[PDB]
Amino acid sequence: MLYNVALIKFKDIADKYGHLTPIEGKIDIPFDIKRVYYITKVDKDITRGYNSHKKLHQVLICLNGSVKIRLKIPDEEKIIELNDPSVGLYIGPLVWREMFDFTEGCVLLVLASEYYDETDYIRNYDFYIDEAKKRFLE
Amino acid sequence: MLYNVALIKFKDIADKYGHLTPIEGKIDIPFDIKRVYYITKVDKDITRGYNSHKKLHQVLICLNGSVKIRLKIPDEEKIIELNDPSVGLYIGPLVWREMFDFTEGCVLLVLASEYYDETDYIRNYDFYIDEAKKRFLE
Numbered sequence: 567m568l569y570n571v572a573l574i575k576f577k578d579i580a581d582k583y584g585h586l587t588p589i590e591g592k593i594d595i596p597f598d599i600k601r602v603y604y605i606t607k608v609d610k611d612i613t614r615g616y617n618s619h620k621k622l623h624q625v626l627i628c629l630n631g632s633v634k635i636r637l638k639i640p641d642e643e644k645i646i647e648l649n650d651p652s653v654g655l656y657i658g659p660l661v662w663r664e665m666f667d668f669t670e671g672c673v674l675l676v677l678a679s680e681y682y683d684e685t686d687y688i689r690n691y692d693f694y695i696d697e698a699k700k701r702f703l704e
Numbered sequence: 705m706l707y708n709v710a711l712i713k714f715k716d717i718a719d720k721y722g723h724l725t726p727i728e729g730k731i732d733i734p735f736d737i738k739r740v741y742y743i744t745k746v747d748k749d750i751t752r753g754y755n756s757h758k759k760l761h762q763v764l765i766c767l768n769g770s771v772k773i774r775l776k777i778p779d780e781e782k783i784i785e786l787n788d789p790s791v792g793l794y795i796g797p798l799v800w801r802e803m804f805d806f807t808e809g810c811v812l813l814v815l816a817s818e819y820y821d822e823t824d825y826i827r828n829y830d831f832y833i834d835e836a837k838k839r840f841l842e
């Protein structure tokens with residue numbers, strides 16, 4: 567079963583004026599926000615990701631529409647659909663992830679614990695498996 | 705001229721897989737991201753904002769759809785439409801703002817330089833005008 571992943575619940579401050587959700591570094595999520603990014607205008611048949619990370623922590627949030635996140639570690643896979651702006655998906659080190667079924671108008675926001683650093687990525691699936699079997703298997 | 709406001713241009717990494725914009729604290733924007741929040745599901749006839757701040761810096765970004773920002777300082781008003789995820793509207797201290805014409809499903813993301821602090825807000829437009837006059841007029 568799926569280590570290094572959680573669903574985080576944010577305040578959804580909602581009235582006749584609309585919805586607002588705040589996320590304060592170290593309060594609403596466990597790390598300081600050094601970097602954000604967001605993904606938009608993804609075509610319906612596209613899959614993104616295909617990677618893990620050595621040390622990075624992130625929280626993914628779908629702020630409009632819906633998107634599916636495939637989460638993999640050795641011998642376990644989960645799909646999580648993100649479709650509620652008040653819910654974040656925390657993904658820590660050594661989880662492999664893929665994102666797909668981006669709806670029209672979909673907005674995927676990620677909060678990240680470190681500046682962009684390509685050396686922290688694991689893009690090679692066989693190296694990922696070797697590393698992750700060390701961590702997760704006994 | 706509209707003091708204390710800028711449009712910042714962010715990287716837009718676009719190809720057949722879609723668009724991604726990264727924003728790194730202190731690099732792509734001048735301050736550290738202590739807090740984000742986002743506004744969604746606002747009805748077409750609503751106006752939000754009606755405030756300013758004493759010391760907060762923020763960057764506003766429309767990640768889907770469109771929204772208009774009314775910016776006011778004494779003796780000046782401008783309206784800016786945000787409809788590009790790759791462009792941030794930096795608003796500094798002692799600028800009054802209102803947001804209206806949220807399209808559906810508009811997403812408005814805000815990056816903020818400080819944790820949420822109600823004592824920093826100026827929500828009374830008379831008090832605003834009073835402090836602002838002292839700043840902006842001769």
Ligand SMILES: Cc1cn([C@H]2C[C@H](O)[C@@H](COP(=O)(O)OP(=O)(O)O[C@H]3O[C@H](C)C(=O)[C@H](O)[C@H]3O)O2)c(=O)[nH]c1=O
Pocket residue numbers: 601602603605614615616617624626663665676682717724726727
């Ligand atoms: C995140 C990021 C990416 N990039 C560049 C690197 C590539 O040239 C391009 C696309 O990167 P990538 O193929 O890694 O994008 P996704 O496949 O959507 O993966 C992203 O979203 C999933 C959820 C992840 O966990 C990754 O860490 C994150 O990169 O953007 C940057 O220049 N700065 C950045 O901060």
Ligand SMILES: Cc1cn([C@H]2C[C@H](O)[C@@H](COP(=O)(O)OP(=O)(O)O[C@H]3O[C@H](C)C(=O)[C@H](O)[C@H]3O)O2)c(=O)[nH]c1=O
Pocket residue numbers: 579586588589739741743752753754755762764801803814820
């Ligand atoms: C921003 C924020 C708000 N809230 C609470 C406080 C209020 O009870 C409620 C809505 O606040 P407000 O009426 O100020 O929301 P907007 O009129 O959309 O204004 C917001 O967006 C414009 C652009 C601004 O510049 C404000 O700083 C920002 O608050 O959410 C929190 O609890 N934490 C937060 O970080």
Ligand SMILES: C[C@H](O)COCC(COC[C@H](C)O)(COC[C@H](C)O)COC[C@@H](C)O
Pocket residue numbers: 754829
């Ligand atoms: C429902 C109405 O259409 C909105 O009225 C907005 C307001 C502020 O405009 C002042 C500035 C010149 O723009 C008009 O009030 C007159 C003043 C305050 O005495 C006050 O609203 C404050 C709420 C949003 O907290």
